[PDB]
Paper text:
The central mechanism for electron transfer across the membrane involves the Mtr complex, a porin-cytochrome complex that consists of periplasmic decaheme MtrA, a large transmembrane pore MtrB, and the decaheme cytochrome [name] on the surface of the cell. [name] is extended approximately 80 Å above the lipid bilayer of the cell membrane, providing a surface for extracellular electron transfer to environmental substrates. [name] is composed of four domains: an N-terminal β-barrel domain (domain I) is followed by a pentaheme domain (domain II), a second β-barrel domain (domain III), and a C-terminal pentaheme domain (domain IV).
MtrCC453Asol was crystallized, and a structural model was determined to a resolution of 1.9 Å. The overall structure was almost identical to the wild-type structure with a root mean square displacement (RMSD) of 0.297 Å. The area around Cys453 was largely conserved, although Fo-Fc maps revealed a negative patch of density where the disulfide was formed between Cys453 and Cys444 in MtrCsol. This confirmed that Cys453 was replaced with alanine and the disulfide was missing, but there were no other significant changes in the environment near residue 453. In addition, there was no electron density consistent with the covalent attachment of anything to Cys444. For MtrCsol, the presence of FMN doubled the amount of peroxide formed, while for MtrCC453Asol, there was a greater than 5-fold increase in the amount of peroxide formed, with a peroxide/electron efficiency of ~1%. The fluorescence spectrum of the isolated complexes revealed copurification of FMN with MtrCC453Asol but not MtrCsol, consistent with the reduced forms of FMN and [name] heme facilitating an increase in the affinity of FMN for MtrCC453Asol. In our MtrCC453A isoform, the formation of the disulfide bond is prevented, trapping MtrCC453A into a state that favors FMN reduction under aerobic conditions, leading to increased production of peroxide and cell damage.
Numbering used by the authors: 44 to 670
């Protein structure tokens, strides 16, 4: 027995006896009644003090009426709560909106059926009818973009409405701690201007992901009638959460404000909304002004790839590159071979900055058709490593010079790209060519795609933007397949040009794409992801292992490469051999056909000898499934 989803509805609220009687109906993912819940509770009963009631400019706030774990299982999927101690403070007002926060703890029914956590709020008028007014600003779904759905976020609960129901203005006032009001706390813990908690945690990582972008949590919605409160209700209590150096009482860093009466008179919604979103809006506008369309052909006699880049405008119309060359900050072309098992390594790949700060490299030209044209100089070794090695794949990244939301001419040929306020990474592209002239091989893209990355990093993520790279914006420009609904898949297959089976610049960094995303995110995003493979994966492509060879897993004492068989290499990124995270010894892994941190030749020869998937049957839902 296992329930996948527990749905909760408050179906009836009756005040016929004084204190409300509250009926909850519980169903599973199949809409069948759930009988026997043992940990159902009204975690909070509240009523809504309306906006301005506590003073001009002040927020609406949730006033406490108690809680209850007292209920009858009616044996039909419904549960009826009573309150032993309703409204201890004697503030109940039937003219106010009434809220109930209902939670069901993860656990087991009696029959042993597993039941997942469930939370909800529902609002009512003072007689249990539909409510007359609400404070509906955000919904739990925005938090699930970045925090694993169904797991506690910091503590107590899994859904933002539960946090909001306890972290009230009344709660903060009662503790003498303004900062624990949820509308203060939530900005505080994602903003690095001040630390939080006894430990003085500086939110460096939250700051680097969220970047004060109001629109990752504040989203307009017919379902959320107070969604525009983020710009319409300026208060010292909320604005000070990130604006930490103003003292409104003393008039330091701002004119004196003794209350919230005048904030909106000067801080109009249009200005607050515009000023906090201006820069991301302007950047997104610049990224969407141009595209590129890239082709690649192999000379059958020289075995060199020629890559052609067509700039296009927002409508897909040709732009001659000569017209915008002075504004191009960088354009880079990286070519590798064998899209399912890259063969040239990091050191052997072909790479060029065809354009730097408005100057063509002498190896790149613009033809009479207005296309940039570049021919590889490295030995591509086409056809030297089986059918996959027939195919060259070329990744194009580029950037435009930009200031205050406009493209500008490059004024400084030596501009180093460190100052990311001076340029915009643009839409990257991927082009395939074959030596044989047959259709190209392509890597699988059916297990991970850029939609998952964009949940935390946004669709405008300028990957590697800085001193070393233009910034790769990943879009349908480099899609070559569709999912089962016909949606273009934006794969990470182009990243393999550098993230090769031989690693990146050093044999020490687990640079292969099969290892690198796991290594970065298990080290730096475990608070968000932990073991949640679904944060990136729709599926595992286990069949892809049959196209892999050796994967670089370590550097020897002399700085040369050590390699593992590909399943062992992939699992060991998070399961280090000889650590507390890996039960299998090296000897045991070798008994299962593996090479652990051996020579490229030994790992290549053994790459299809691993018996791991005889026992292991990983799925995204449970990657641990085995024996
Ligand atoms: C991605 C853009 C995010 C969205 C949307 C939300 N949160 Fe977040 N949060 C995020 C990061 C990158 C971090 C820092 C993690 C780290 O490792 O340092 C956080 C941090 C928090 C915290 C602090 C405690 C913690 O879990 O580390 C809280 C309490 C928190 N976040 C809550 C939260 C809620 C309730 C959200 C929806 C309104 C929410 N976050 C959105 C990234 C993102
Ligand atoms: C009451 C039933 C709570 C619910 C639901 C949530 N939290 Fe909470 N939180 C609670 C208490 C009693 C405290 C200590 C307050 C104090 O006096 O210091 C907290 C504290 C936090 C903090 C630390 C805030 C700070 O020190 O600046 C965070 C980041 C926090 N709580 C987050 C949080 C989130 C995201 C919740 C919903 C998932 C949540 N809390 C619910 C009580 C209650
Ligand atoms: C998620 C990590 C958020 C980001 C980023 C920002 N805000 Fe936010 N805000 C968030 C929550 C969960 C809440 C509480 C909502 C509730 O129902 O209590 C808020 C609240 C505000 C408010 C208060 C509105 C009111 O009625 O008093 C304001 C003025 C506000 N938020 C503004 C704001 C701005 C300007 C941001 C970008 C700079 C922004 N928020 C980011 C969650 C998150
Ligand atoms: C963190 C999530 C923030 C909250 C909450 C609020 N603001 Fe903010 N504000 C923030 C940043 C990162 C910036 C710089 C933005 C940029 O692109 O330049 C700002 C800026 C302002 C400004 C302009 C700067 C100035 O010196 O006055 C104003 C007037 C401003 N912010 C007002 C404001 C108000 C009224 C808020 C509560 C509704 C508020 N901010 C919240 C980050 C955050
Ligand atoms: C008009 C007479 C104002 C009243 C009343 C309030 N504020 Fe203000 N504020 C005003 C100006 C002209 C500026 C500078 C704008 C700029 O872009 O330079 C501000 C600034 C702020 C900021 C930003 C602080 C910073 O980034 O340095 C915040 C967060 C802010 N103001 C909030 C705020 C609140 C909450 C008010 C009522 C208590 C309030 N301001 C009153 C103009 C006026
Ligand atoms: C939220 C749950 C995330 C998902 C999904 C993905 N990434 Fe991520 N990434 C996340 C965090 C919290 C951090 C560390 C930030 C810090 O400041 O330390 C990262 C880091 C990266 C980096 C490093 C560069 C950077 O901008 O910090 C890269 C290049 C990166 N992440 C890429 C990436 C890709 C391609 C993803 C889809 C496979 C991806 N991330 C998912 C949080 C999250
Ligand atoms: C060669 C021009 C590269 C391309 C194309 C991509 N990456 Fe990269 N990446 C590269 C180097 C030299 C390094 C540092 C050494 C190392 O292997 O760690 C990286 C690093 C990453 C990281 C780790 C964190 C960081 O340093 O930013 C991640 C998560 C990463 N790279 C992801 C990534 C993705 C998703 C790419 C396709 C969009 C991608 N890289 C392309 C070199 C190059
Ligand atoms: C985003 C930060 C990721 C998380 C979280 C996890 N995986 Fe992953 N995985 C990721 C990428 C970018 C790739 C490379 C795809 C490529 O083209 O090489 C992978 C690859 C795997 C593979 C190889 C098979 C495949 O589908 O490509 C396996 C078996 C795999 N990942 C397993 C896995 C497990 C078990 C996770 C949860 C603990 C997990 N991944 C998280 C990115 C991310
Ligand atoms: C990082 C992105 C991971 C990759 C890649 C893989 N695993 Fe994993 N695994 C990971 C975590 C964070 C955990 C939970 C650890 C804890 O105790 O909380 C696990 C757990 C397992 C387990 C269960 C633990 C045990 O002692 O056996 C198994 C069997 C397991 N993982 C197997 C496994 C295999 C076969 C992988 C390659 C296909 C693999 N994991 C990759 C994180 C990550
Ligand atoms: C059956 C005889 C097995 C073969 C063949 C392989 N593994 Fe295994 N593995 C097995 C069991 C019974 C367990 C523990 C399961 C549990 O829940 O406790 C494991 C565990 C792992 C783990 C998790 C390690 C940890 O977290 O400590 C990993 C990463 C793992 N196994 C990988 C792995 C690889 C790469 C194999 C082929 C070389 C392999 N296993 C073979 C059972 C069996
Ligand atoms: Ca209802
Ligand atoms: Ca819910
Ligand atoms: Ca802070
Ligand atoms: Ca293309
Ligand atoms: Ca075999």
């Amino acid at each position: 027995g296992s329930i996948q989803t527990l749905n909760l509805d408050i179906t009836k609220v009756s005040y016929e006896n004084g204190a409300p009687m509250v009926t909850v109906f519980a169903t599973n993912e199949a809409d069948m009644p759930v009988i026997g819940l043992a940990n159902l509770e009204i975690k909070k009963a509240l009523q809504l003090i309306p906006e301005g009631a506590t003073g001009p400019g002040n927020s609406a706030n949730w006033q406490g009426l108690g809680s209850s774990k007292s209920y009858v299982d009616n044996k039909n999927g419904s549960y009826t709560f009573k309150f032993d101690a309703f409204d201890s403070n004697k503030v109940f007002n039937a003219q106010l909106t009434q809220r109930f926060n209902v939670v069901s703890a993860a656990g087991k029914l009696a029959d042993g059926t597993t039941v997942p956590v469930a939370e909800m709020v529902e609002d009512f008028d003072g007689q249990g009818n539909a409510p007359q007014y609400t404070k509906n600003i955000v919904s739990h779904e925005v938090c699930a973009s970045c925090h694993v759905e169904g797991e506690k976020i910091y503590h107590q609960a899994t859904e933002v409405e539960t946090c909001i129901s306890c972290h009230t203005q009344e709660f903060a006032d009662g503790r003498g701690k303004p900062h624990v009001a949820f509308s203060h706390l939530i900005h505080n813990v994602h903003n690095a201007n001040k630390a939080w908690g006894k430990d003085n945690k500086i939110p460096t990582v939250a700051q680097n992901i969220v970047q004060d972008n109001c629109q990752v949590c504040h989203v307009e919605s017919d379902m959320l009638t107070e969604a525009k409160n983020w710009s319409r209700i300026p208060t010292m209590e909320v604005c000070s959460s990130c604006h930490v150096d103003i003292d409104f009482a003393a008039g330091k860093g701002h004119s004196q404000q003794l209350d919230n009466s005048n904030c909106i008179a000067c801080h109009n919604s249009d200005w607050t909304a515009e000023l906090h979103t201006a820069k991301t809006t302007a950047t997104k506008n610049l990224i969407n002004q141009y595209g590129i369309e890239t082709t690649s052909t192999i000379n059958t006699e020289t075995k060199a790839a020629t890559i052609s880049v067509q700039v296009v405008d927002a409508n897909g119309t040709a732009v001659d590159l000569k017209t915008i060359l002075p504004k191009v900050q960088r354009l880079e072309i990286i070519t590798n071979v064998g899209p399912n098992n890259a063969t040239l390594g990091y050191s052997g790949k072909d790479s060029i900055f065809a354009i730097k700060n408005g100057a063509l490299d002498p190896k790149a030209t613009i033809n009479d058709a207005g296309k940039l044209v570049y021919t590889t100089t490295k030995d591509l070794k086409l056809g030297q490593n089986g059918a996959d090695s027939d195919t060259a794949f070329s990744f194009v990244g580029w950037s435009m010079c930009s200031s205050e939301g406009k493209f500008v001419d490059a004024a400084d040929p030596a501009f180093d790209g460190v100052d990311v306020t001076k340029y915009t990474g643009m839409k990257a592209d991927l082009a395939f060519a074959t030596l044989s002239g047959k259709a190209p091989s392509t890597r699988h893209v059916d297990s991970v795609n850029m939609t998952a990355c964009a949940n935390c990093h946004t669709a405008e993520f300028e990957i590697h933007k800085g001193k070393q790279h233009a910034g790769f914006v990943m879009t349908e420009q480099l899609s070559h397949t569709q999912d089962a609904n016909g949606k273009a898949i934006v794969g990470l297959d182009a990243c393999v040009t550098c993230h090769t089976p031989d690693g990146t610049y050093s044999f020490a960094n687990r640079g292969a794409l099969e290892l690198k995303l796991h290594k970065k995110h298990v080290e730096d995003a475990y608070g968000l992801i932990g073991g949640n493979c679904a944060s990136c994966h729709s599926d595992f492509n286990l069949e892809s292992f049959k196209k892999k060879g050796a994967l670089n897993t370590a550097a020897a004492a002399d700085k040369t490469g050590l390699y593992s068989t590909p399943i062992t290499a992939t699992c060991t990124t998070c399961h280090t051999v000889g650590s507390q995270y890996m039960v299998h010894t090296k000897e045991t892994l070798e008994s299962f056909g593996a090479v652990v941190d051996g020579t490229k030749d030994d790992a290549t020869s053994a790459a299809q000898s691993e018996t791991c998937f005889y026992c292991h049957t990983p799925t995204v839902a449970d990657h641990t499934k085995v024996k």
